[PDB]
Design goal:
Structural class: mainly beta
Name: Carbonic anhydrase 2
Entry title: Crystal structure of human carbonic anhydrase isozyme II with 4-{[(5-butyl-2-pyrimidinyl)sulfanyl]acetyl}benzenesulfonamide
Assembly: monomeric
Bound molecules: the ligand CCCCc1cnc(SCC(=O)c2ccc(S(N)(=O)=O)cc2)nc1, zinc ion
PDB class: lyase/lyase inhibitor
Number of strands: 15
CATH architecture: Roll
Keywords: drug design, sulfonamide, metal-binding, lyase-lyase inhibitor complex
Oligomer: monomer
Distance between the termini: 44 Å
Radius of gyration: 17 Å
Largest sheet: 13 strands, mixed
Strand content: 25-35%
């Protein structure tokens, strides 16, 4: 039932998921001037050399590129994190127009899209248990702006016609998520939530300061996807982003400057 329209979009979510109005909801606007530089924050450690992608899926809200998370192969640690977080999937949120799409904003600036690399804390044994813990997930957020193509994204873009509609999946092996990372790992971090239902407050957010560039043609392809299932009226998969939520009693920390 929940989705991104007038009648079931983010403003409606609290009815099914009352935690929508909770104390640590995501996304948020990152006020770069009031973010506190924290010299005790470590460099982020991204170990994706052994990543094993398996499949890409249109789940009717976005597309997920899923990884084999049954061994320590693609892991996030360091930064603000204690312990080891395993990559389970990535997906994006994007706009109907280049002027919007991102979930987090930076001094109210919206980017064309936002990539979420979703990782779960190995101490909880799996994803479903981890989401029920306040430190269960680490999501690495990366902004996309429109300009030069991102070569490492093209394999993703090229398979989308094969998963046009809700419920479609395709084999997606040997995809290397290192090709989606900007040069710098400078980041902001704060305690938040999943940005889609069930909106669980289980996320340490790590948002990179440096956006990646993707071409207009790459993002256009994202916009050809469908929210609907095959043999239904076409609703383009666009504007699948939740707007900024109240910061409330939280401090955003910066790894830099
Ligand atoms: C309430 C009891 C149900 C426990 C349970 C909750 N959510 C999920 S899945 C939602 C999900 O996979 C996900 C991952 C990342 C993000 S985001 N957009 O914050 O990166 C949003 C949703 N699976 C099991
Ligand atoms: Zn997301």
């Amino acid at each position: 039932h929940w989705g991104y329209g007038k009648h079931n979009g983010p403003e409606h979510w609290h009815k099914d998921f009352p935690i929508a109005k909770g104390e640590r909801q995501s996304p948020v606007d990152i006020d770069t001037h009031t973010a506190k530089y924290d010299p005790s924050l470590k460099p982020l450690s991204v170990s994706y050399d052994q990543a094993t992608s398996l499949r890409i899926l249109n789940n009717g809200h976005a597309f997920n590129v899923e990884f084999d998370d049954s061994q320590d192969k693609a892991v996030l640690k360091g930064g603000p994190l204690d312990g080891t977080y395993r990559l389970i999937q990535f997906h994006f949120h994007w706009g109907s127009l280049d002027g919007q799409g991102s979930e987090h904003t930076v001094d109210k600036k919206k980017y064309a899209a936002e990539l979420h690399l979703v990782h779960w804390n190995t101490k909880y044994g799996d994803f479903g248990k981890a989401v029920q813990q306040p430190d269960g997930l680490a999501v690495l957020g990366i902004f996309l702006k429109v300009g030069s193509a991102k070569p490492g994204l093209q394999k993703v873009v090229d398979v989308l016609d094969s998963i046009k509609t809700k419920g479609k999946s395709a084999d997606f092996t040997n995809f290397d998520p290192r090709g989606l990372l900007p040069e710098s790992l400078d980041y902001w971090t704060y305690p938040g939530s999943l940005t889609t239902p069930p909106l669980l407050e289980c996320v340490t957010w790590i948002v990179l300061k440096e956006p990646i560039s993707v071409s207009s043609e790459q993002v256009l392809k994202f916009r050809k996807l469908n929210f609907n299932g095959e043999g239904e009226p076409e609703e383009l998969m666009v504007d699948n982003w939740r707007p900024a939520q109240p910061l409330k009693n939280r401090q955003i920390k910066a790894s830099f400057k």
